[PDB]
Amino acid sequence: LDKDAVKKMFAVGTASLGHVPVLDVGRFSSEIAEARLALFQKQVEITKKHRGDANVRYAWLPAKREVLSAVMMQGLGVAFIRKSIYGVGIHLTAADCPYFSARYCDVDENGVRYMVLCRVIMGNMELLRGDKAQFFSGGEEYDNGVDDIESPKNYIVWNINMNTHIFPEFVVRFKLSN
């Protein structure tokens, strides 16, 4: 996608919160990001061959200014791992639902918030049954987890998959009211 489409995705997806000014949309562009994209695209090939369909989706990851620098070289295991009602992994918000996690993006010293748009290899999606103690796939037939099959709001990528199945691509800088 281009930066305008990402901006539009974020604007339509946060409309319910009122005035949400988008200050900037950026894309990670470096030798490490390229190598990390190549790694991700090989996992896409593998998951496609294994399941028939890689089922790559866009999803939103709440971030903060302080972790952006680190994210490409050392991975998502900086600090992005959360425990929810659905289990433990990386929790991302579906493409049309950034309103859901916008407030969970930490404000920096200037009032600015940061949300990352990621490509996620969801593969064969497991409908999650609400197990607090789940930290991996409920079975060999499933890859990553989702809360609702028809209208997804939350994806759970298991810890084992965090570096293979998520490519952080775009950073959206924004503000909210009080």
Numbering used by the authors: 273 to 350, 353 to 452
Original paper wording:
Our crystal structure of the RCD1 PARP domain provides first insights into plant PARP domains, and we identified several molecular differences between RCD1's PARP domain and the catalytic domain of mammalian PARPs. The RCD1 PARP domain adopts a fold that is overall similar to mammalian PARP domains. However, the RCD1 PARP domain structure confirmed that the amino acid triad H‐Y‐E, constituting the active site of mammalian and plant PARPs, is not conserved in RCD1 (Kleine et al., 2008; Jaspers et al., 2010). Nonconservation of the His and Tyr residues critical for NAD+ binding in canonical ADP‐ribosyl‐transferases suggests that the RCD1 PARP domain does not bind NAD+ and therefore is likely to lack canonical PARP activity. Consistent with this inference, the RCD1 PARP domain is not stabilized by 6(5H)‐phenanthridinone, an inhibitor of mammalian PARPs (Wahlberg et al., 2012), at elevated temperatures. Conceivably, the cleft of RCD1 that corresponds to the catalytic center of active PARPs has evolved to bind other small compounds. To test whether this region of the protein is required for the biological function of RCD1, we designed three RCD1 mutant variants with single amino acid exchanges in the cleft region. However, an independent transgenic line (A) expressing the same construct fully complemented both rcd1‐1 phenotypes, suggesting that differences in expression levels might account for partial complementation in line B. Overall, our results suggest that the integrity of the presumed NAD+ binding cleft is not essential for RCD1's functions in plant development and signal transduction under oxidative stress conditions. Nonconservation of the H‐Y‐E triad and our finding that RCD1 retains its biological function when amino acids within the presumed active site are mutated suggest that the protein does not have PARP activity. Given that the N‐ and C‐terminal domains of RCD1 mediate protein–protein interactions, the PARP domain of RCD1 might act as a scaffold bridging and/or coordinating the action of the terminal protein interaction domains.
RCD1 is the founding member of a plant‐specific protein family characterized by a central domain with sequence similarity to the catalytic domain of Poly‐(ADP‐ribose)‐polymerases (PARPs) (Lamb et al., 2012). In addition to the central PARP domain, RCD1 and its paralogue SIMILAR TO RCD ONE1 (SRO1) have an N‐terminal WWE domain and a C‐terminal RST domain. RCD1 and sequence‐related proteins localize to the plant cell nucleus and bind several transcription factors via their RST domains, possibly explaining why loss of RCD1 function affects plant development and several stress signaling pathways (Katiyar‐Agarwal et al., 2006; Jaspers et al., 2009; You et al., 2014). In contrast to canonical PARPs that covalently modify target proteins by ADP‐ribosylation, Arabidopsis RCD1 does not show PARP activity in vitro when expressed as a GST fusion (Jaspers et al., 2010).
